[PDB]
Amino acid sequence: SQIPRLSAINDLHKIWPTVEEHGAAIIESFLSLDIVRRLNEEVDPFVKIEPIPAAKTKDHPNHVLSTTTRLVNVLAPISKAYREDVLNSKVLHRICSDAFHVYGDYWVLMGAVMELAPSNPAQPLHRDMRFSHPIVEYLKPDAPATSINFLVALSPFTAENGATHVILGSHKWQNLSNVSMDATVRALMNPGDALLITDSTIHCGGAETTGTETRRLLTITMGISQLTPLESNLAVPRPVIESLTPLAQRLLGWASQRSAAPRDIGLLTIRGNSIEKTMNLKAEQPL
């Protein structure tokens, strides 16, 4: 039983429901080739200057990722393609609104580009959020997913190069005795394609067996605005922020947020008023 593939331009409303039922979906041509090329181009140097995850020079080192992994987050300052095309993607927003309607507003928990070097070993099967948000493990099983992850291929995902393994239907599992690599299916994708999974979906990066190929992806974790993000955009220059759309500003934490409660009082408010209104924050102002 393989992962469901859906069109990003045709069968839309079918994406979230599909992931909901199966826990994983592949969205063909989520990003266009032109968009991928610009992103690749823009982040290229930052990826080459990124040290190992657990570098000693970091005060918040990542001890979970392998030494052959380079992860670059806080992409709004680095790339125009990400902060304009990606953050405003209509397909992403429709999927998110469908997924998080019961909770309310959603934002970016993390936007990052990941590069796996040649001979990168396979990760152990896991679920996202366990190393940052312990609260998630205390949610009731029928609770709707609080975060989802868009895994966009910036390069080819093949069996030989480490394409993502996924266990279909495991987002609903309560007993984890059944977890094994034998229950997984692969996510073979071309650049621009995206694998969508919920925070409860068991999966893992594959093993790179060629010794040649380098795999890159853009990982976008979207979550309800009630959860603190992994990355911060506080230090992003005002001009950049003021250059984005109000929607993008909100996803980045530069706006107040709302919940689904009928008489919602809001998040990140300032004495009854929004962050943006208090600060008279401009939007869509070019550099």
Ligand X SMILES: CN1C(=O)c2ccccc2NC(=O)/C1=C/c1ccc(C(F)(F)F)cc1
Tokens describing residue 28: 């063909």
Site string for Fe ion, 100-139 (x = CB under 5 A): ----------------------------x-----------
- Of ligand X, a copy of itself, Fe ion, none, which one does residue 124 interact with (CB within 5 to 8 Å by kind)? ligand X
State in angstroms the smallest separation of the CB of 24 from a copy of itself: 22
128 near ligand X, judged by CB under 6 A: yes
240 contacts a copy of itself (rule: CB under 8 A)? no
- Is 93 assigned to a binding site? no
Binding a copy of itself (rule: CB under 8 A), the pick from 83, 133, 165, 250 is: 133
Which residue in 31, 78, 81, 112 binds ligand X (CB under 6 A)? Answer: 112
Using CB under 8 A as the binding rule, the residues of this chain from 141 to 160 that contact a copy of itself are 142-144, 146
231 binds a copy of itself (CB under 8 A): yes
Q: Is there binding between residue 102 and a copy of itself (CB under 8 A)?
A: yes
The CB-nearest residue to ligand X is 123
Whether the Cβ atoms of residue 28 and residue 200 lie closer than 8 Å to each other: no
Query: Token match 């993390």: residue?
Result: 110
Residue 225 within binding range of ligand X, rule CB under 6 A: no
| Token reading at 157 | 């995902």
- Chain centroid to Cα 10, Å, comes to 22
In degrees, rounded to 5, the angle at the alpha carbon of residue 199 between the alpha carbons of residues 42 and 10 is 65
User: Quick one: 65 exposed, middle or buried, by C-beta within 10 A (0-12, 13-18, 19+)?
Assistant: middle
**Which 3 state secondary structure label does DSSP give 83?**
helix
Angle at 204 between CA 159 and CA 86, to 5 degrees: 90
**Residues 6+ away with beta carbon under 8 Å from 184:** 125, 165, 166, 167, 203, 204
CB of residue 20 to Fe ion, shortest distance in Å: 19
Residue 270 makes CB contacts below 8 A (sequence gap 6+) with 256, 278
Q: What's the min distance (Å) between Cβ of 181 and ligand X?
A: 13
- Ligand-binding annotation for 60, yes or no, is no
Region label for 9, one of left (φ > 0), alpha (ψ between -120 and 50) or beta (otherwise): alpha
Task: Give binding residues as ranges.
Answer: 126, 128, 203
Interface residues with Fe ion (CB under 5 A) are 128
Footprint on this chain of a copy of itself (rule: CB under 8 A):
50-51, 53, 55, 57-64, 72-74, 102-104, 130-135, 138-140, 142-144, 146, 224-232, 234-235, 254, 256-261, 263-275, 277-279
